[PDB]
Design a protein around this ligand. Structure first.
Ligand SMILES: *[C@@H]1O[C@H](CO)[C@@H](O[C@@H]2O[C@H](CO)[C@@H](O[C@@H]3O[C@H](CO[C@H]4O[C@H](CO)[C@@H](O)[C@H](O)[C@@H]4O)[C@@H](O)[C@H](O[C@H]4O[C@H](CO)[C@@H](O)[C@H](O)[C@@H]4O)[C@@H]3O[C@@H]3OC[C@@H](O)[C@H](O)[C@H]3O)[C@H](O)[C@H]2NC(C)=O)[C@H](O[C@@H]2O[C@@H](C)[C@@H](O)[C@@H](O)[C@@H]2O)[C@H]1NC(C)=O
Ligand SMILES: *[C@@H]1O[C@H](CO)[C@@H](O[C@@H]2O[C@H](CO)[C@@H](O[C@@H]3O[C@H](CO[C@H]4O[C@H](CO)[C@@H](O)[C@H](O)[C@@H]4O)[C@@H](O)[C@H](O)[C@@H]3O)[C@H](O)[C@H]2NC(C)=O)[C@H](O[C@@H]2O[C@@H](C)[C@@H](O)[C@@H](O)[C@@H]2O)[C@H]1NC(C)=O
Ligand SMILES: CC(=O)N[C@H]1[C@H](Oc2ccc([N+](=O)[O-])cc2)O[C@H](CO)[C@@H](O[C@@H]2O[C@H](CO)[C@H](O)[C@H](O)[C@H]2NC(C)=O)[C@@H]1O
Ligand SMILES: CC(=O)N[C@H]1[C@H](Oc2ccc([N+](=O)[O-])cc2)O[C@H](CO)[C@@H](O[C@@H]2O[C@H](CO)[C@H](O)[C@H](O)[C@H]2NC(C)=O)[C@@H]1O
Ligand SMILES: CC(=O)N[C@H]1[C@H](Oc2ccc([N+](=O)[O-])cc2)O[C@H](CO)[C@@H](O[C@@H]2O[C@H](CO)[C@H](O)[C@H](O)[C@H]2NC(C)=O)[C@@H]1O
Ligand SMILES: CC(=O)N[C@H]1[C@H](Oc2ccc([N+](=O)[O-])cc2)O[C@H](CO)[C@@H](O[C@@H]2O[C@H](CO)[C@H](O)[C@H](O)[C@H]2NC(C)=O)[C@@H]1O
Ligand SMILES: *[C@@H]1O[C@H](CO)[C@@H](O)[C@H](O[C@@H]2O[C@@H](C)[C@@H](O)[C@@H](O)[C@@H]2O)[C@H]1NC(C)=O
Ligand SMILES: *[C@@H]1O[C@H](CO)[C@@H](O)[C@H](O[C@@H]2O[C@@H](C)[C@@H](O)[C@@H](O)[C@@H]2O)[C@H]1NC(C)=O
Ligand SMILES: [Ca+2]
Ligand SMILES: [Ca+2]
Ligand SMILES: [Ca+2]
Ligand SMILES: [Ca+2]
Ligand SMILES: [Mn+2]
Ligand SMILES: [Mn+2]
Ligand SMILES: [Mn+2]
Ligand SMILES: [Mn+2]
Lengths: 238, 238, 238, 238
């Protein structure tokens, strides 16, 4: 049996147990600021990611076991103009050596908008801009090896409000669940889908966040993570 | 700081750390069988509850602190005829000395269908029968001192399928959240509302389940809880 | 699988999740005051106990499994005259219906100084007075169904200093371990012994503290518990 | 507030969340084999280490806070001839970029046998061979920036038996405690000392194990770690 856990109720400057990639910085208020802010305004064409330093043991081929996990986090998206919000934020699992990919609507996750099994990516996206591949309206999506979500639900961005997210994986039913609550307005969202982690991901992954602002100067927003917990449990074989 | 936790991934016969009330028994398959089954068929007019034996310290007037909590459980409702399903199951918090009340549509929670602040009850109901006070259709409800829910959402009973529920309370925003997932069909539900526990409940409560079958012979269903976890955390003051 | 946990970093007045027996009260400073204090002085012939309200599932005859557990606590003994310290404090496991027994050197645990398997008691004692059955000197003892310890080590009371205790049980080796540290003086103690819980205790027990002051007016001390954690884990069968 | 935890009840081959250094391999039985074995016999002059991949946040200069931690592990030392056992095993904390140093009696920890504050090492050693700097007999030691222990206790190696170790740090008293129990013989050992982590270590460290076999062919033993848990808690400022 193997377990991994961590909790951040806020972030310290120079967090050496996180891999910060692209534009990510830690604010003096203790937030993970994924996309650039200059003079209190979000900067366009910005991309930042943050991963937990330790690989997570997500499944084991020898024992044929798959881990359960649960992660919770709080985030804020602040768009100067809500109608022009772009592009969004995702929580994701990827190979240990994962590096930022294309900015904008590809969210730093993918090199292009096609499906490719060598991506080895599972993500939950909070998507604020309708790309050509997207459903109508802002939405939450479960993504497997593609920016084109396997399943989506409508989600109304509550501009500059704290969103509380829980994402969990139940290995026995191969079910990934994602929920988002805005306590400020008592609004909540949930979706779930079958995602076979053993078939999609390598045995060890890194986990974390990615976010991207829009590729034009009037389509911008901030993407801050305020707090993050993670727990994974790889059981003994039956 | 005070915390309480417990986990049951299944139930043992004669569980001395649960207070079983009314008809509740533990099955040899390890389920908490809240309402009676006879010859593999649910019995009408049955009511059973199960509470964790220890009082939970939910808030403290001296330090003016309120606990966070989270509970998860799995349950199954099996109705021979889904249209005639009655009456449902609830998770609840109540005074330490709480005893079963009226059966049927009052779910063992309330003496009548009126609102009364001396009840000191907060519940999340999974309501399978439309009483005169209910919305149209089966629904999940957040209940505060009344069988007449403060907030409801439509919920389609997936007959004899395992439902995974999470209910959490965030003290800082006074927000109660309840979610239900059916992994078998990838269907999910969530709602949340403001519930001020400090104003509704005494400082110590008992927590648990209640369920009731219908008060007529053709309006019956089973109500089994398969697993239950609970975690509460009453923080130090500021 | 079944687990039970709780944490008290201090105690609240009227703790409804503890069974207080004999003279025990909670002080306004948040301590569990097991033996009486009157006008800032310990009272002789006083006996108090405190148990967690919920029964703990320590083993299961159906699945033939035995729990691991670990408890930690901090305590203080303050004797006006250290040479006349009596009688001591114990952590213990006992049947759910356990009641205080004889005061003084029997520590509220036993009716007499003999061995009897119907006691169903396992205790770790911090023994400040040499009775006829005791080794020379103040000592820590592991007790099984008798005040006459199965195993003892010398322990020097550090008068009015905080002692940090950890007691753990490893089911697979039937080993009970107890350690005590005085951080103030960098002094530490440890002992362990084979104790077969399945053979000694019923399937469910209550756990807690007992303490007794001396049976003469010049042989007195206080016995305060400052903090307490407990975790038990009854595994699935192999 | 920041916490980090992990559990291994056994080890998988190619553990990508551990940094294996020197000779360390994972056995097919799931043990961390720190020093080499060839044809079932320990090889002399072997040195291996294993660190958790993620840096641990042990103190924070911004908030002026220091973490508590607790680690537990099980290990086995098997010497063909107990009188010729060498050299031993240690648990340690060191800079993130730590690399194996000198073999033999320096345990892979130090470049020489002198005290040097630039080492930035805190270790607990299980020392099986009397070097020129050592006390008489096999011993457990607390080491700060030197192979010459700050404090030692006698410890009798129980050849090829499982040792259960707990090492904990209490930031409020700056106290490091280490205990070892052999359940097989009911033998136990403990020591503790004041160690100011903020003054000795950098803000982030890596944690893990090191072990070395003797530098002559007749002074050899195996050093296997069977299981390992770690929990650290860096609190909010007070
Ligand atoms: C170590 O402690 C152990 C636990 O205390 C001791 O075992 C107890 O010993 C008790 C006697 O001291 C014994 O109590 C008696 O039980 C009789 C049988 O009870 C059951 O069976 C009946 C049907 O067959 C049924 O009617 C009963 O209701 C019970 O279910 C019972 O008849 C006795 O009651 C009569 O006799 C007494 C004495 O004259 C009267 O006072 C009483 O009113 C009645 O006329 C008696 O019962 C007890 O009476 C007093 C009351 O306060 C008690 O609550 C009530 O129980 C008890 O059953 C056992 N317990 C167990 C678990 O075995 C043990 O003593 C030794 O071992 C026991 C088993 C026994 O063999 C003793 O003779 C031994 O001394 C202690 N061991 C040692 C080595 O000292
Ligand atoms: C506390 O620990 C520190 C860190 O380890 C010690 O500092 C190191 O000491 C070692 C000595 O064992 C030094 O390594 C030797 O360095 C020489 C010189 O190399 C350089 O120059 C030559 C030619 O001049 C070039 O050929 C090289 O390419 C290189 O540029 C080398 O030839 C030897 O083979 C060793 O590798 C090491 O440099 C040094 N590091 C630092 C950061 O100072 C420190 O002890 C130090 O060294 C000793 C000998 C004394 O001089 C102390 O005053 C130094 O502090 C140690 N403190 C104590 C008291 O032991
Ligand atoms: C100004 C403008 O309209 N630029 C548009 C751009 O074409 C130009 C034109 C001139 C220059 N130039 O070097 O000045 C640079 C780029 O074509 C892009 C599509 O390929 C538009 O990118 C989209 O921007 C959106 C916000 O407007 C979202 O970020 C959306 O996700 C993103 N689409 C994707 C697939 O990433 C981008 O907005
Ligand atoms: C056959 C029949 O009419 N049965 C009906 C029953 O009637 C009688 C007849 C005589 C006596 N008496 O005091 O002797 C008492 C009751 O009165 C019950 C209400 O008071 C009906 O209960 C309702 O039954 C429904 C399923 O049919 C649901 O369970 C519903 O929740 C429940 N309503 C409530 C408020 O609990 C029940 O259907
Ligand atoms: C003043 C005095 O000496 N009182 C003594 C008291 O008195 C008597 C005197 C004669 C007879 N009798 O059989 O006729 C009966 C009782 O007998 C008590 C039982 O032996 C002494 O109790 C002991 O007191 C000690 C502190 O001084 C410790 O608390 C010690 O653990 C305690 N012993 C026990 C077993 O609890 C108690 O000290
Ligand atoms: C047979 C014998 O005496 N072998 C000894 C060896 O001897 C020689 C003699 C001449 C030359 N030379 O440079 O020609 C080289 C080696 O010198 C080693 C360094 O002092 C001895 O190392 C010690 O070995 C012990 C077990 O035998 C322990 O492992 C002990 O910790 C270890 N010492 C240290 C500091 O690591 C090693 O035992
Ligand atoms: C699928 O994704 C991976 C990385 O996520 C790419 O490396 C693959 O590109 C193909 O393989 C690489 C190594 C290189 O040879 C390239 O020329 C190939 O196209 C990518 N595959 C495709 C078809 O897009
Ligand atoms: C509100 O709830 C309390 C708690 O359950 C009830 O006891 C109240 O009923 C009234 O007071 C009780 C004690 C009893 O005297 C009864 O006859 C009264 O009706 C109830 N209050 C209401 C319905 O107004
Ligand atoms: Ca998009
Ligand atoms: Ca109803
Ligand atoms: Ca005594
Ligand atoms: Ca040595
Ligand atoms: Mn999308
Ligand atoms: Mn309803
Ligand atoms: Mn004693
Ligand atoms: Mn040594």
């Amino acid at each position: 049996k193997e377990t991994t856990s961590f909790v951040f109720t806020r972030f310290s400057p120079d967090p050496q147990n996180l891999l910060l990639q692209g534009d990510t910085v830690v604010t003096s208020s203790g937030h993970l600021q994924l996309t650039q802010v200059k003079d209190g305004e979000p900067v366009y064409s910005s991309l930042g990611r943050a991963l937990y330093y330790a690989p997570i043991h997500i499944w084991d081929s020898n024992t044929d076991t798959v881990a359960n996990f649960v992660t919770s986090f709080s985030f804020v998206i602040d768009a100067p103009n809500k109608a022009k919000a772009a592009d969004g934020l995702a929580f994701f699992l990827a190979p240990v050596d994962t590096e930022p990919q294309k900015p904008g609507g590809l969210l730093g996750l993918f090199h292009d908008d096609r499906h490719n099994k060598s991506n080895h990516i599972v993500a939950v996206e909070f998507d604020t801009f309708k790309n050509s591949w997207d459903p109508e309206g802002t939405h939450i999506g479960i993504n497997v090896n593609s920016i084109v979500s396997r399943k989506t639900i409508s989600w109304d961005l509550e501009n500059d409000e704290v969103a509380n997210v829980v994402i969990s994986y139940q290995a026995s039913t191969k079910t990934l669940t994602a929920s988002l609550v805005y306590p400020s307005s008592s609004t909540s969202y949930i979706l779930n889908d079958v995602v076979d982690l053993k078939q999609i991901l390598p045995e060890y992954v890194r986990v974390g966040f990615t976010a991207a602002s829009g590729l034009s100067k009037d389509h911008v927003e901030t993407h801050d993570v305020l707090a993050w917990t993670f727990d994974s449990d790889l059981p003994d074989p039956s």
